[PDB]
Amino acid sequence: DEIDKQNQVILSELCKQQAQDLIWAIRTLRANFRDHQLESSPRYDKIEDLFEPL
Amino acid sequence: DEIDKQNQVILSELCKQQAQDLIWAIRTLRANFRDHQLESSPRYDKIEDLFEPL
Numbered sequence: 001d002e003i004d005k006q007n008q009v010i011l012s013e014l015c016k017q018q019a020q021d022l023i024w025a026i027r028t029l030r031a032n033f034r035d036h037q038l039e040s041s042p043r044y045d046k047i048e049d050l051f052e053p054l
Numbered sequence: 055d056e057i058d059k060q061n062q063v064i065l066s067e068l069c070k071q072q073a074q075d076l077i078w079a080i081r082t083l084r085a086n087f088r089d090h091q092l093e094s095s096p097r098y099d100k101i102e103d104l105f106e107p108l
Binding site for chain 2: 027028031032034035036
């Protein structure tokens with residue numbers, strides 16, 4: 001109801017989300033992605049190849 | 055004042071410290087200590103050699 005007033009409300013919820021330190025984030029990703037691995041069961045059947053280009 | 059009753063009070067404060075997941079802790083230490091380094095300024099003199107055996 002009153003759809004046009006929802007652009008502002010959805011905007012107000014998108015603007016609340018927290019900041020991310022990009023230097024901690026990339027140094028953490030780089031360090032923890034160097035070795036650590038997902039295990040070769042059937043649950044993880046194709047997942048490890050989404051994370052190989054990254 | 056009333057010193058002997060302080061054994062229990064100091065004991066009650068030591069027993070409140072939080073638990074530490076040892077698998078997250080060691081995998082984090084190992085990963086983030088593989089490359090990352092301290093500066094070679096004058097403040098950080100002789101510090102980096104405390105962290106070489108570790």
